[PDB]
């Protein structure tokens, strides 16, 4: 929930966070989620601030308005974001890793978003089953398997949380051939 | 039946979308209806079964 | 002066109005001055009666 303000003098439409303090002399135009929940990677803050302008009124930005009366010249406006970048997976996790019992497989996200404390998580499908199983202990990017049995085969599937509640994943399914006892 | 269409490419690029990566297709008319008799038209109203 | 007509109907219709009922008329022109010798052009002021 990405909240815009907007002042009607210098024209710029503040894109605030959900917790943010409009400046003195915008007022709040609406709010829009700028990953879009249906959508998520089509549309940009641009194609979301002309959404909510578009019912607004050129004659105080303040109340709705429509078609012959509302702020659609895109070009004066000068969108001034200080919304915290999106939570976007730089390196995401290979598509397929294959070693052989005994090798050593390693996996390694990148998390370019906004916060500070970025966690992180880990889970684990056994390749017949349904549901995740928390991998304990290792909670900080690089993830590695040492001495990888058979029974630590199937997909593993990273979770980088922000601080406030945004969250990206990326699986990688992990396969080793077991050669007879 | 009056039907607009512009297809995406040099006309529909314009300053708000220098690009030109959309279009529509906006179709409108006028309709109107004057009864001259009232007369000469008779409603039945029923319950049906279910 | 500069007349620019777009006519409602096929020229204004963006993605803002796809059945395009809106059309304008601007003139525009340009003006300016060269006061080559500022010395015959002389304004005397006072007041003026009711």
């Given amino acids: 929930e990405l909240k815009v303000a907007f002042n009607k003098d210098t024209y710029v439409a503040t894109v605030l966070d959900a917790s943010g303090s409009v400046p003195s002399g915008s007022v709040n135009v609406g709010t829009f989620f700028h990953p879009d929940e249906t959508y998520p990677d089509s549309y940009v803050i641009y194609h979301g601030v002309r959404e909510l302008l578009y019912k607004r009124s050129e004659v105080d930005p303040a109340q709705p308005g429509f078609w012959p009366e509302n702020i659609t010249n895109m070009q004066a406006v000068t969108i001034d974001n200080k919304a915290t970048a999106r939570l976007v997976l730089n390196t995401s996790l290979p598509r397929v890793v294959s070693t052989i019992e005994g090798g050593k497989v390693t996996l390694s996200v990148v998390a370019l978003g906004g916060k500070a404390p970025l966690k992180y998580k880990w889970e684990f499908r056994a390749p017949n089953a349904s549901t995740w199983t928390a991998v304990s202990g290792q909670t900080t990017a690089n993830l590695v398997l040492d001495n990888i049995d058979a029974d630590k085969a199937g997909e593993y599937k990273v979770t980088v949380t922000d601080a406030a509640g945004t969250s990206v994943d990326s699986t990688a399914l992990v396969a080793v051939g077991a050669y007879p006892p | ?50």
């Fill in chain 2, 1 to 50: 039946f009056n039907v607009m269409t512009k297809m995406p490419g040099k006309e529909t690029a314009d300053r708000n979308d220098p690009y030109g990566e959309t279009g529509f297709s906006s179709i409108k008319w006028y309709y109107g209806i004057l009864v001259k008799r009232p007369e000469r038209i008779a409603v039945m109203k029923a319950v049906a079964p279910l």
